[PDB]
Write a protein that binds this ligand. Structure first.
Ligand SMILES: CC(C)c1ncc(Cl)c(C(N)=O)n1
Length: 119
């Protein structure tokens, strides 16, 4: 029932994601010189360094907010992909499955702790 435990849990999950080779295209903001039309398709860029920095700045109130930004990394990859078989998009699908498998207990524990706090 620790209402604050999600933060270290998210730091550790981001550390695992940075170790994953599948995260390399998503570790820093997309390079507009490499993809000059990126902002014509993607309204809200997002990347894992921005997520980590937002967390470390104390600018996430809950793991749901972090999870919304990580899911935006994956939906941006899906929106920008020219093909469902592209290399970078395939890396995002595997990384998304890994992320969803690990974030589920973080979200459940947080929501349970908050419900206990408000009982
Ligand atoms: C990470 C950004 C640059 C991105 N998102 C999705 C795809 Cl699938 C691609 C690509 N180059 O094929 N690039």
């Amino acid at each position: 029932y620790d209402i604050q435990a999600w933060k270290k849990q998210c730091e550790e999950l981001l550390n695992l994601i940075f170790q994953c080779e599948d995260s390399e295209p998503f570790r820093q903001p997309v390079d507009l010189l490499e993809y000059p039309d990126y902002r014509d398709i993607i309204d809200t860029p997002m990347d894992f360094a921005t997520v980590r920095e937002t967390l470390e700045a104390g600018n996430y109130e809950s793991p749901m907010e972090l999870c919304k930004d990580v899911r935006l990394i994956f939906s941006n990859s899906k929106a920008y992909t020219p093909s469902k078989r592209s290399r970078i998009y395939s890396m995002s699908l595997r990384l998304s499955a890994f992320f969803e498998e690990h974030i589920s207990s973080v979200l459940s524990d947080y929501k349970s702790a908050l419900r206990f706090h408000k009982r």
